[PDB]
Amino acid sequence: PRLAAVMPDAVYALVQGTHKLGEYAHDLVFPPTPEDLRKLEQQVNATIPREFDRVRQRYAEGKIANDEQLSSELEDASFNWYRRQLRTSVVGATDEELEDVAVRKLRLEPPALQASL
Amino acid sequence: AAVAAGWHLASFALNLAFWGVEGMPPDRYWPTSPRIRLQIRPGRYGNMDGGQRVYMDYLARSEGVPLN
Amino acid sequence: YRREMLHVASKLNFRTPAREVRIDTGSPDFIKWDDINGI
Amino acid sequence: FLGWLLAPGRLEFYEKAACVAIALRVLGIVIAIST
Amino acid sequence: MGQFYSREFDGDPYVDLMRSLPERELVWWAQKVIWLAEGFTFVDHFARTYPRLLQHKCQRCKGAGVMTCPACLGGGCRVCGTACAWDAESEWMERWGEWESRLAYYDKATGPLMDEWYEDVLNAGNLEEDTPPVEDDPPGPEVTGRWAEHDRALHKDKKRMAALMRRWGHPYDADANLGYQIVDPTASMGENVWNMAQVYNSLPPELNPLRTQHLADRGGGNTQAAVEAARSAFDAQVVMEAALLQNLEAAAQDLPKPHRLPPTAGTVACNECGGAAWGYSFFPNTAVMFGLERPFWGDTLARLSKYWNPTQVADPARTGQLLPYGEGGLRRLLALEAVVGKAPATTGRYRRDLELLLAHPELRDGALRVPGGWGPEGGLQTYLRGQQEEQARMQRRRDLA
Amino acid sequence: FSTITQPDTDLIARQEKGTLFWDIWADFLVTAADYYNEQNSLIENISNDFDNL
Ligand SMILES: [Zn+2]
Ligand SMILES: [Zn+2]
């Protein structure tokens, strides 16, 4: 049944299954820290866009949903973030004109080295 | 080129001089039918009763019989 | 499976009449070689 | 070698043959269990 | 499939069991086709991969079939090849223009948009519309500025497009682009070559002979000749492209190239082979059979480093040799290039245009996009001449009234 | 000559299937038949030896 689709699924199954087996066997010989499981949670917490915070707290206080009212809630924040990204890519960010986009995509300005030391 | 072709022509003339078997006795290590020498015979499967018919026409086309 | 068994059992007469024999050598009436005589 | 073995034409042949083989096997199952 | 009845199939213990089980006969037919497919594959692999042992290469040119003309390394050389067509660097952008024109015909990337617009302009009666957008209107005139010009030209959007539709039809009607539903990316290859081989669909309008088959006679005697004499050059270009890509696909591996092409403007033909770089020999070419056909980097490094370093054993004291080798050493012994490098002499032909691009900064506006080229017949200068000429025309038309 | 005149895949598979159906299954049901001794008899013996085997 359309092997041209089965082969990527086969390699994907292999990769993901090997990763899961590895993490399993790795947190057995080394049990995970009972507190830095919160630290990795904080690390992934620091990476979420802002368009989702208006939903996030709403999930803590019950208000949010049953199970699907949520799944259609995340789509709105998602598409808001998506259209913001389209705008930033094409016409620029929130605080930069067209010249700043030109110097961004021409790589005229080095990463600031003097400041970081 | 003449020499290199004369070699082959000499070989062909020698093979011509033989012309057949008259002069060659029978040999028992080399019969004339390779199936005797190789011990080949049919089994139990692959033998249909409708095969002999086509067999015959093969025979008829090998011996030259033009009837078919 | 079963379906085929039926077909074989339908032909069980055309196959071969050779019945293997399970002979005994510790049987009570099993005949040794030279227990028969006049031969 | 693999670029020649997994060419699109050969891929579609393998697909068709696998489909027909699955069909015949499941039909054997169906006619066998209903007996 | 009920074929093994008859009387021609008695005598095999297995055909009778298939007489009573048609599933067995189906399995038998499937297997009897699959085994033959597998045999075909085996033999195809053998015939594909076996001739690779019998290929031998010339040992002087190493299978290139072509050596260098050293004089042309440092009224030209009469010994080495002839130039190619894409060597004339003054005709590059014109050739690219023709090619992109011919390519815009076949291009079916924007197919769905053209299709929906064609269906909208054919029916024009369904009108499954919805609520029109809240329209802001363009600025009134007498406000000079750039934003005003942008908005004003943007709002005159429907009458201009209407004039465009009135002059040129929908592209599918003028045959300017390929047909409506000739090709489908998911149908099959056979159906698509059938549809394209139907009525000169593989040819653009400019070369389609039906467009011209009606009038050609004493007047010029050329239109039907200068079209079959262009379609020929077109097809020659296409076949040459196929040949080049087969050469590249052979060279992607380390195989020798199938098409031997004549030498070019810097190279001469090898004189051991005639230029036929390799061949077949009935002798198995052990270097391939044991995998020793590549030369171990360190060896090549050593050979080259010893080739580029000629050694002098004699001393110019004993042998009264005062000058290095060569001829006319005496004349050889007699500005700010060191500060700002040398001047590149392959780009003089653009100088003029560059100067224009400095006298008229307004030409760098993001709204304009000229064709492209360098001569007074291309791109920038065409737009500039047009602008000056039309402003002069309008100037003269102002005063007469 | 003696290589290209060997039985191809069809005949080899036929041999294997014939031995599976006749070298074990035939003599076994023969033994069952003698232990139990025209389609009615077929059904009878297949049912009986199916049950008690
Ligand atoms: Zn050579
Ligand atoms: Zn030269």
The closest of E168, E254, E181, E175 to E210, measured between CA atoms, is E175
**Any chain A CB within 8 A of the CB of D19?**
yes
| Distance between CA atoms of residues E285 and E50, nearest Å | 12
- Count of B-F CB contacts under 8 Å: 16
Ligand 1 center–CA E58 separation, angstroms: 5
Q: Within 10 Å of residue E278's Cβ, how many Cβ atoms?
A: 20
Q: Within 10 Å of residue E207's Cβ, how many Cβ atoms?
A: 19
Ligand 2 center–CA E264 separation, angstroms: 10
**Any chain D CB within 8 A of the CB of C7?**
no
Token pair of E204 as six digits: 């653009």
Ligand 2 center–CA E61 separation, angstroms: 17
What single-letter DSSP state applies at residue B24?
A: P
The closest of F23, F20, F25, F50 to F36, measured between CA atoms, is F50
What single-letter DSSP state applies at residue A56?
A: H
Touch between chain D and chain A (3+ CB pairs, < 8 Å)?
yes
Q: Within 10 Å of residue A73's Cβ, how many Cβ atoms?
A: 17
Chain F residue with CA closest to B37: the answer is F2
Q: Are B44 and F18 in contact (CB under 8 A)?
A: yes
| Distance between CA atoms of residues E26 and D24, nearest Å | 7
Cα→Cα distances F27→A12, B44, C20, E5, F14, Å: 51, 18, 10, 27, 19
| Distance between CA atoms of residues E240 and E262, nearest Å | 13
- For residue B45, list chain F residues with Cβ-Cβ distance below 8 A: 11, 14-15, 18
Q: Which residues pair with E67 in a beta bridge?
A: E268
DSSP SS3 for B40 = coil
Cα→Cα distances D7→A32, C27, D3, D12, D16, Å: 47, 71, 6, 9, 14
Q: Are B68 and B61 in contact (CB under 8 A)?
A: yes
> Rg of chain F over CA atoms, in angstroms?
17
Do the chains contact at F9 and E14, CB–CB below 8 Å? no
| Distance between CA atoms of residues E360 and E365, nearest Å | 11
> Rg of chain D over CA atoms, in angstroms?
15
CA distance E52 to chain C (A): 51
What are the phi and psi torsion angles at C22 (to 5°)?
-95, 95
What lies within 8 Å, CB to CB, of E222 at 6+ separation is E216
Chain B residue with CA closest to E6: the answer is B50
List own/partner pairs for F43-48 with CB under 8 A and 24 or more apart.
F43/C6, F45/C9, F46/C2, F46/C5, F46/C6, F46/C9
- Count of C-F CB contacts under 8 Å: 30
CA distance E17 to chain C (A): 7
State the residue for tokens 């700043």: A100
In angstroms, the first-to-last Cα distance of chain A is 59
Mapped to the 3 state alphabet, what secondary structure does chain E carry?
Answer: CCCCCCCCCCCCCCHHHHHCCHHHHHHHHHHHHHHHHHHHHHHHHHHHHHHHCCEEECCCCCCCCEEECHHHCCCCCCCCCCCCCCCCCCCHHHHHHHHHHHHHHHCCCCHHHHHHHHHHHHHCCCCCCCCCCCCCCCCCCCCCCHHHHHHHHHHCCHHHHHHHHHHCCCCCCCCCCCCCCCCCCCCCHHHHHHHHCCCCCCCCHHHCHHHCCCCCCCCCCCCCHHHHHHHHHHHHHHHHHHHHHHHHHHHHCCCCCCCCCCCCCCEEECCCCCCCCEEECCCCCHHHHCCCCCCCHHHHHHHHHHHCCCCCCCCCCCCCCCCCCCCCHHHHHCCCHHHHCCCCCCCHHHHHHHHHHHHCHHHHCCCCCCCCCCCCCCCHHHHHHHHHHHHHHHHHHHHHC
Touch between chain C and chain B (3+ CB pairs, < 8 Å)?
no
Q: Are E84 and E264 in contact (CB under 8 A)?
A: yes
State the residue for tokens 């402003």: E391
The closest of E391, E392, E372 to E382, measured between CA atoms, is E372
What is the distance, to the nearest Å, from the Cα of residue C29 to the centroid of all Cα atoms in its chain? 18
Token pair of A43 as six digits: 């690390």
**Any chain D CB within 8 A of the CB of A31?**
no
What are the phi and psi torsion angles at E208 (to 5°)?
-65, 120
Token pair of A45 as six digits: 């917490």
Do the chains contact at D20 and E30, CB–CB below 8 Å? yes
What single-letter DSSP state applies at residue F20?
A: I
What single-letter DSSP state applies at residue F22?
A: I
Angle between helices A53-60 and A73-91 (to 10 degrees): 160
- For residue E26, list chain D residues with Cβ-Cβ distance below 8 A: 24, 27
State the residue for tokens 């990769």: A15
Ligand 2 center–CA E79 separation, angstroms: 6
Q: Within 10 Å of residue E220's Cβ, how many Cβ atoms?
A: 10
Least CB-CB distance to E14: which of F8, F9, F17?
F17
**Any chain F CB within 8 A of the CB of C21?**
no
Ligand 2 center–CA E277 separation, angstroms: 20
What are the phi and psi torsion angles at F33 (to 5°)?
-60, -45
What lies within 8 Å, CB to CB, of E265 at 6+ separation is E80, E81, E82, E83, E84, E87
What are the phi and psi torsion angles at E67 (to 5°)?
-120, 175
What residue type is E226 in one-letter code?
A
Task: Please name which ligand lies nearest the alpha carbon of E76.
Answer: 2
CA distance E39 to chain D (A): 14
| Distance between CA atoms of residues A78 and A84, nearest Å | 10
The closest of E32, E62, E86, E89 to E287, measured between CA atoms, is E62
What lies within 8 Å, CB to CB, of E372 at 6+ separation is E93, E97, E378, E379
| Distance between CA atoms of residues A75 and A53, nearest Å | 14
| Distance between CA atoms of residues A101 and A95, nearest Å | 11
Ligand 2 center–CA E282 separation, angstroms: 37
What is the DSSP track for chain C? -HHHHHHHHHHTTSS---------SSSSS---STTS---
Q: Within 10 Å of residue E58's Cβ, how many Cβ atoms?
A: 19
Token pair of E87 as six digits: 């060597």
Ligand 2 center–CA E9 separation, angstroms: 78
Q: Are E105 and E177 in contact (CB under 8 A)?
A: yes
**Any chain E CB within 8 A of the CB of F7?**
no
Ligand 2 center–CA E183 separation, angstroms: 50
What lies within 8 Å, CB to CB, of A81 at 6+ separation is A49, A51, A52
| Distance between CA atoms of residues F42 and F26, nearest Å | 13
Token pair of B68 as six digits: 């078919």
Q: Are F46 and C2 in contact (CB under 8 A)?
A: yes
What are the phi and psi torsion angles at A83 (to 5°)?
-70, -35
Do the chains contact at F10 and E14, CB–CB below 8 Å? no
State the residue for tokens 């467009």: E211
What are the phi and psi torsion angles at E278 (to 5°)?
-155, 180
Interface test with A, best of D10, D11, D22 (most A CBs within 10 A): D11
- For residue F30, list chain C residues with Cβ-Cβ distance below 8 A: 12
What are the phi and psi torsion angles at E229 (to 5°)?
-90, -5
What lies within 8 Å, CB to CB, of B56 at 6+ separation is none
**Any chain D CB within 8 A of the CB of A106?**
no
Touch between chain F and chain D (3+ CB pairs, < 8 Å)?
no
State the residue for tokens 């001449």: E385
DSSP SS3 for A8 = helix
What are the phi and psi torsion angles at E279 (to 5°)?
-170, -175
State the residue for tokens 């012994």: E333
Task: Please name which ligand lies nearest the alpha carbon of E268.
Answer: 2
Interface test with C, best of E20, E21, E24, E27 (most C CBs within 10 A): E20
Q: Are E204 and E102 in contact (CB under 8 A)?
A: yes
**Cα-based torsion angle of the residue sequence D19, D20, D25, D28 in order, rounded to the nearest 10 degrees:** 140
Touch between chain B and chain E (3+ CB pairs, < 8 Å)?
yes
In angstroms, the first-to-last Cα distance of chain E is 94
| Distance between CA atoms of residues E374 and E380, nearest Å | 8
Those residues of chain E whose CB sits closer than 8 Å to some CB in chain F are 12-14, 17, 31-32, 35
What single-letter DSSP state applies at residue B46?
A: S
Token pair of E69 as six digits: 């003309």
What residue type is B41 in one-letter code?
R
Q: Within 10 Å of residue E98's Cβ, how many Cβ atoms?
A: 9
| Distance between CA atoms of residues D34 and E18, nearest Å | 19
Q: Could you tell me which residues of E are annotated as the binding site for Zn(2+)?
A: 58, 61, 69, 72, 77, 80, 270, 273
| Distance between CA atoms of residues E27 and E34, nearest Å | 11
